Amino acid sequence: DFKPQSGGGKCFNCYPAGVNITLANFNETKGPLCVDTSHFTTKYVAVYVGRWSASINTGNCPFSFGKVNNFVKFGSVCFSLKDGCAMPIVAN
Amino acid sequence: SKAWNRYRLPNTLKPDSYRVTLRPYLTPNDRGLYVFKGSSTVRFTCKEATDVIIIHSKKLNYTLSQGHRVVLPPDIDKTELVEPTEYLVVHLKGSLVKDSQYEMDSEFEGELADDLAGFYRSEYMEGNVRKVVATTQMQAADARKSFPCFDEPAMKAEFNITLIHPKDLTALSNMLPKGPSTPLPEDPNWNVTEFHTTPKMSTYLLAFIVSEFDYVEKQASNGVLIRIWARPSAIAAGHGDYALNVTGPILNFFAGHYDTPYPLPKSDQIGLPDFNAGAMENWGLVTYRENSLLFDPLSSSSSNKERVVTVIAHELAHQWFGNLVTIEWWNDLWLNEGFASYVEYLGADYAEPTWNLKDLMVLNDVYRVMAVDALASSHPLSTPASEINTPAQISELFDAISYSKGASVLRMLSSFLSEDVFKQGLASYLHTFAYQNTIYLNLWDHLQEAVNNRSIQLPTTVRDIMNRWTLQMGFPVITVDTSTGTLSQEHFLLDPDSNVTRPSEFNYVWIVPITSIRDGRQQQDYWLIDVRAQNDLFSTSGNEWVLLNLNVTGYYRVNYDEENWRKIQTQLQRDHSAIPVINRAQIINDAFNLASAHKVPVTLALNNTLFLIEERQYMPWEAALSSLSYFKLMFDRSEVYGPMKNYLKKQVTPLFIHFRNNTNNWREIPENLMDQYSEVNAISTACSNGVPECEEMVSGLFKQWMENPNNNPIHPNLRSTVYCNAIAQEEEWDFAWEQFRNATLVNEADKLRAALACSKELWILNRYLSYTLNPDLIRKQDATSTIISITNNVIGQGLVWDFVQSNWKKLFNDYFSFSNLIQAVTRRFSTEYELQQLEQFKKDNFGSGTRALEQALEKTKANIKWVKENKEVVLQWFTENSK
Amino acid sequence: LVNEADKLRAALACSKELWILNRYLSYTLNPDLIRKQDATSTIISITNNVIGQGLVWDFVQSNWKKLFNDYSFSNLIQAVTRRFSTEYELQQLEQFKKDNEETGFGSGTRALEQALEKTKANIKWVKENKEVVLQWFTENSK
């Protein structure tokens, strides 16, 4: 989620307002959320307006969020909003 | 006559710094006034030993200090406000010692009237709150009215501005905010903002804005910060996006063109909900109307795009020429606004290079003002500086001549010089006189020097030629006798018998550059420097022909012998692509205007339309329609209107079919703006003249819209035409009426308000007229536009005439714009019937329109004769071409 | 056949094209196009067309001196005026009188006075009823 700055004194565009980003049932006090079960699915939920948009970058990973659901097999995987290989989200 | 009897300052005082504080109280006071507190100190140097202070001040309640309005350095004797000249006059007891700097300081209060003059306020509805904005309009005369100053363009000085506003709001001025906004220690409900010192600038260019607008921002590659401000609700819809998209490229264009990087650090643009003019260039805080800065791709036409980009290019052009090098006195005004009026067309060219916009300068300025200057009642450009003194005498300069003739003559200047030499000259001028004041003669000095360094050949000095054009009214019609290539010029007076009152020190002899082409090949430049000359370059034989004034860069009309007109027509019908697009409009409009002067048979002007049967370009269709409007308006009640309509159908029928193919049954617009305009002209003309295809296709679109009230199928470019034509064919009118009552968007409300006048049913129109009196049905400022729209409908003519004959003393004594109203209502008049009725209406009884009534009489007499002179021949011609 | 010629001479007035109507008026003066015998009633038929009301009124009020030498003015002036329903149209009628009675009006000389009376009656009658009648129609027409 994010919003434009708004309210009559601000850039509509210079930087998002009210950012909120979450990883489902990741608990920071419990570290990287690992994929234990034989199968997993990766799902994205936009929450944000106007010509604002956002997406996830590959970062350095050899694969992308979502794309991994096309039957890529691994020995193990774990996900975390804290640092593995990075993949930054970019708003535009 | 004392100094405060005169309307000019003495040159004995030169200011050299300013400070301002302003507190707009946007809430009304107990007595319902809106007031601001202001403080100011100015530092000034005594240029000549003196003992009295003379400074502009208007409509200010001052505060007395030391028993007097101001504090000074010998003592002050007394202080007075000489209202008829707006001077604060402050006698010193001693004499102010020369070559010394002194503060004059004051504190005062003023009114935020909504007068659009000075520090006025504007109010607008946002959501359901009547928001209030404080703004500034300071065109020439009003700058003093916000704070005391030496309010002259030549008296340039440096300003520090400080603002104090309700904490919620934001403040703006020419510079950036010097540090963030701080709560006022007197009351944290107020903020305080200070700005960096302005450069050396003239008082008429300040701006102060306090507002709740919100902005969209870009950083230019040149490093300047550029920033569109508008209503937050408007900006969230992205309506500012287009402005920010174009403003970068244009700025870097001018940075190239003047060889001079942009002088300020920022470039705010602000779109106000209402404004008197369209725009004002206030240095680095450029101000526009909503409808001339914001753009919505979902509702505005391509015409809105070209208006937006054009206006932007103009007001940005002022940011160098005009604001960096300023005019010495208002008598030179034509040099600024006309020059910018030129460059705007080059500016937009850079931003949207696929639209060929440079061509429309011909329609919109050259020919828009040739028809005005072709009168003995015109005036030259360079009036003597002593003639302009009072604010009325300054304000009168902002007219069609000062803009468009200035544009035309400067275009011609840039064309007989090499354009790169004009660039070099202009750049050298701006480099030399930056931050100073100049007269036009300094510009023509710099051009003369650059021409010499390039050694461009000219028959005389540039000063000579441009004074031949600058300071005498009118323009020549050149006359060629191709049988020998003899050449002559004479002053083109549209009424060939009008008495010339104003003399010419050159007896109306110009020097004229004449580019020309022969059989599609460009010939070499020739100069005319006399009433007559001969040159074999214009002699012709056999099938040879000549055309003059290529691309109509030259500001003069052209005439040829009959045989040469036949040759040109033959070429043009054989292959019109051989003759440049602009010149095909030129060769029409010349024929018509010459015909009105009895310098040629009208049959010739009509002949020149013949080739249009296979023309596709926008320009010549536009020029033809614009001339033939006179014929329609004169004959639309006569029998002659019968054949004429059929003729236009024949002419326009193939063109319509072309677009029907080339738009896949109207499913997409052309990609080129000129082609979109040609589309609109095609559909409009062919439909209104009655091709059967329109009564089906436009009706179909409109009924499809009625099936989809929220989901309008009609592309915004077509809207205004299809609306009116569908209305021309009750339930549609009532549908459009309920739409209008529900209409939220002003562009659409206007388009509907026009289209509803296209109805055929007299009871509909009479209802409309009755509603024109109901302030809730139509906003009382706009009733006149409705009356005019109903008047131009041929069925409504007599209705509106009898209506005004009924209501005149009413709406005169209590309404407004009687002038153009009377213009609209009378211009159909063409026989002694209505002449008698009109003179009776005079005798039976006009505000500002009083002289317009005289105008109506005058042209009516001409109309009376003109129809008598031409009807049968025109009729015989059209019936001939009726086939 | 004279019957059909007259049916057409009437029906040509029912056109909605103003320029057709005015060219028809021009032909209405041309005796070879339509004979003096019936020009007057053709103008009356134009007046019956609500669009022709304006044409005929401004025509007659601006050129009646021509018609006065030769055209029957009585019923023509009746037909042209009978739509008048406003004090302004009363003013127009009385000024046309003051503008032209210096030549009289022939057979119309009394009829104009009658019209001056009846128009005044119509004025008040409209004032007496425009709202109520509108109300009725606005209801029962549903």
Ligand SMILES: *[C@@H]1O[C@H](CO)[C@@H](O)[C@H](O)[C@H]1NC(C)=O
């Ligand atoms: C306005 O006043 C507030 C306090 O009311 C202050 O914090 C702020 O910096 C000031 N400026 C703006 C733009 O709000």
Ligand SMILES: *[C@@H]1O[C@H](CO)[C@@H](O)[C@H](O)[C@H]1NC(C)=O
């Ligand atoms: C600006 O105009 C260009 C036209 O070249 C277009 O490609 C672009 O999408 C527009 N908008 C922005 C934000 O650049």
Ligand SMILES: *[C@@H]1O[C@H](CO)[C@@H](O)[C@H](O)[C@H]1NC(C)=O
């Ligand atoms: C004339 O104008 C056209 C633009 O319509 C331009 O392409 C052409 O180069 C111009 N030629 C001259 C000689 O000015």
